[PDB]
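User: Before I run my own analysis I want an independent prediction to cross-check against. Here's the chain; please return only the structure tokens and, at the end, one sentence I can use as a sanity check.
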Amino acid sequence: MGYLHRVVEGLKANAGGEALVSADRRLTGAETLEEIHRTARALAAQGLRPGDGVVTLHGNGVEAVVLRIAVQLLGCRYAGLRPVFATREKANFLAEAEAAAFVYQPDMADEAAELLREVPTPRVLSLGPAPLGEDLVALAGAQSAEPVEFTADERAATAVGFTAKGVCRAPFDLEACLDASLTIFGEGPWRFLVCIPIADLGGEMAEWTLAAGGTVVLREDFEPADILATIGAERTTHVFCAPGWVYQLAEHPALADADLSSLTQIPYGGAPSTPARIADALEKLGRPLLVHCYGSQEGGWMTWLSAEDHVRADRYLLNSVGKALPGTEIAIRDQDGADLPVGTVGEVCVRSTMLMRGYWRLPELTAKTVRDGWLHTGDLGRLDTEGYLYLVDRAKDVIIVEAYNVYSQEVEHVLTGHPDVRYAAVVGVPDHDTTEAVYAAVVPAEGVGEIDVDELRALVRTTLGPVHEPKHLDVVDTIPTTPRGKPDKSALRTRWRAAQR
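Assistant: Structure tokens:
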């Protein structure tokens, strides 16, 4: 058994039905498994052993999934360049990757040249006929479809996902991730719309979709009109979305008429969500679909918020990423690294069998990052007693000054406690080039004449420490608020930013 055992088992399970689907080609589990075996054989022929690095430059086609899996079957290291990266960044990735092969989609030959020019690589192959190297699809066609058993170290990296640096994953932790996927997404066959690069997260999600006996529906990227069409046309059960995408789906005029019956779930994540707009989306979908996932290449799946937990009447949880997965442990830690009680804000630190094997060729930063089995995620948040995780909103609630975290509520509370101040709003605003500064607006109390701004600066300095001191501090008659009754801190930020003459 193992990760690839699991993928193959799901394909065999699904041999009669659809496994890989795109606008251009359609394969069954039988037809998919054959190509994988053939491709693996062909790659083996070219001279590729376990541990040998295989860099790819492709899109989200069927042959790209076949290749990603095949490379991993041999126990080679698949290293997908996402096409969205700049050529400068790809050349770095390729240079550092110690590649033995380079595999590129035919219509990207322009870029393959730029790269192979700068980083000459052996065994160049093309997914179909193309100017450079040989044609891998042709090589595979001419080849035995006899099964290829997985026979490498289950704990040896077979995938690198790029981020300035590359995250190695081994089958051991990939299976751990697949297990969580069944927790979050449910079990059984999934018709899973993947429009994330197969070069990384999309690839993982395709591997998993297949392992569970499912069909992958591939699109090249997210566009709301496609997708709404694709969902109904392919009777998809799941589409994984960035939060941005969820909003675009919800705001789309085509949505009233689109057929979403097939959907059981719209898992989303990858970036901070906007509670207000998620709530809009809940109303328009008019059904419990949204499931918030919190994950990284480094940490695997860490938490998730069920669909029901988006709409319970007794709690509000749109500011939550939900609770730990089975086998996942979460501590919140001070800038030095001892635990904090529930309720307190710190760095979210995780330990599960889903952690990455490490950063590629960066063994020192790997140790700065995973410390004694515990991933230091660099994200800031708080747990609660019911077990829910809440990541601070970095725009409203933190300010980073000289590499120190300043919390806006802490500064507000201190200012407000001055008898001359009845209300404060504190926000970080862009300063010189790439720094942040603490700005503050305070509302005077009843009868207060003139406010001594310097006194309030001293108060913060000699309560919290020097860095928490507001650089700028305006006395205002009021703080604008949002329609949900929270202080409008982006209005304050925009206003202060624009006035920096």
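Sanity check: The longest strand covers residues 374-383.
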